[PDB]
Design a binder for these strands. Structure first.
Lengths: 122, 122
RNA sequence: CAGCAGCAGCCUGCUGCUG
RNA sequence: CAGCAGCAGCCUGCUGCUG
């Protein structure tokens, strides 16, 4: 399957996660999780994120309106399907959802959501 | 029950809705729906919204971090409960969710979400 | 707009288990 | 971090019905 994502997954092993836990706290995780769902099919990423401007830039590059539309168009036809973006960081989940006919507006709200969550003050 | 909302519901009757439908389109609804959930209990509003600055100001006043905390604190105790804000406008739904311990950050993201959705270009 | 039903997903909270 | 299970809600899409 063609993913909407432009960067590889970065999930930590169980050992790396434990080590990070011993060293640090829910407000300073290794990163964030995000996902894109098109009908039944869901694509997921855990991406490292350290709250710098460099890191923000890098992770905002993990998908675009174009990469999402290319991935999503595989699943399209005459009938509308449900499409959903989710992101979770520091205890808060944001989900942006609606039909395929609205996908451009779902991307616009998804990217704005992602940016505001990742920049939310301590 | 004490609501998190500071303005009354504005749901249209079935007849008003039909009349509006005959006169206008999903991109020009009478307004938007939003809701706040605390554990099992959900509070809901349909609010008129006409995409002016005056109207934006008015509807952004429908809840505050304080009104949400007063309402939500009724349901609190030692264990965390789930808390959720949702808003739907013009085919797109945004939901912001997490545990009561995070409620201040849920409000901050909820209000930012609401503002961006209600201002999204045609 | 609202309520009801069938189907299909998704997210949140709680509890327990595994790695 | 990941997978599994019990419970409780929520949102999206499709289909049908009512007002």
């Amino acid at each position: 399957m063609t993913s909407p994502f432009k960067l590889p997954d970065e999930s930590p092993s169980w050992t790396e996660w434990r080590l990070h836990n011993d060293e640090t706290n829910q407000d300073n995780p290794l990163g964030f999780k995000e996902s894109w769902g098109f009908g039944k099919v869901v694509f997921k990423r855990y991406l490292r994120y350290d709250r710098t401007e460099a890191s923000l830039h890098r992770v905002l590059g993990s998908w675009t309106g174009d990469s999402v539309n290319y991935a999503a168009s595989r699943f399209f036809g005459f009938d509308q399907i449900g499409c959903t973006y989710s992101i979770r960081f520091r205890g808060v989940s944001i989900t942006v959802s609606g039909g395929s006919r609205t996908l451009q507006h779902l991307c616009e709200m998804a990217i704005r959501s992602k940016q505001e969550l990742l920049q939310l003050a301590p």
